[PDB]
Amino acid sequence: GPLGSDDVEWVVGKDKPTYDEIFYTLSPVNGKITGANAKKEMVKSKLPNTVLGKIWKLADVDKDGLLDDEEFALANHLIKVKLEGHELPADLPPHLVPPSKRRHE
Amino acid sequence: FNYESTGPFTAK
Ligand SMILES: [Ca+2]
């Protein structure tokens, strides 16, 4: 088997339970929620429409219009991190890309 | 009718 597997830790998974409880309260269907309820969270966090698009762009790598529990966790993280007073680089590093959506060349 | 472009935010 592979022992020396280069698998970078997804820093979003550290506070995922929290975004999970927020994900399940927006009515998840088969592991995804509608962008309407995500939109709702986003606008509750008082982020400008420009920043809203920023977050979506960074959260949904494949752009399937729906947010998986993984994707919403990432989005939610960016959101609350903005509320923390942090800013976003607006670029997606490999340790932010979901394991099942990432490539490394 | 609700319709988006590249997300529910980036609608024109
Ligand atoms: Ca997605």
Query: Is the C-alpha dihedral spanning A83, A78, A95, A15 positive or negative?
Result: positive
C-alpha span between A51 and A42 (Å, rounded): 9
Tell me, yes or no, if B9 comes closer than 8 A to chain A by beta carbon: yes
Tell me, yes or no, if A19 comes closer than 8 A to chain B by beta carbon: no
Q: Ion ligand 1 — residues with CB under 5 Å? A: A 60, 64, 71
Decide yes or no: CATH 1.10.238.10 for domain A1-105: yes
Cβ distance of A63 and B7 shorter than 8 Å: yes
- Closest C-alpha to A54, from A33, A78, A71, A37: A78
**CA separation (Å) from A63 to A11, A21, A94, B12?**
20, 23, 17, 17
Tell me, yes or no, if A52 comes closer than 8 A to chain B by beta carbon: yes
Cβ distance of A42 and B7 shorter than 8 Å: no
Distance of CA A76 to the CA centre of its chain: 6
Technique of determination:
NMR
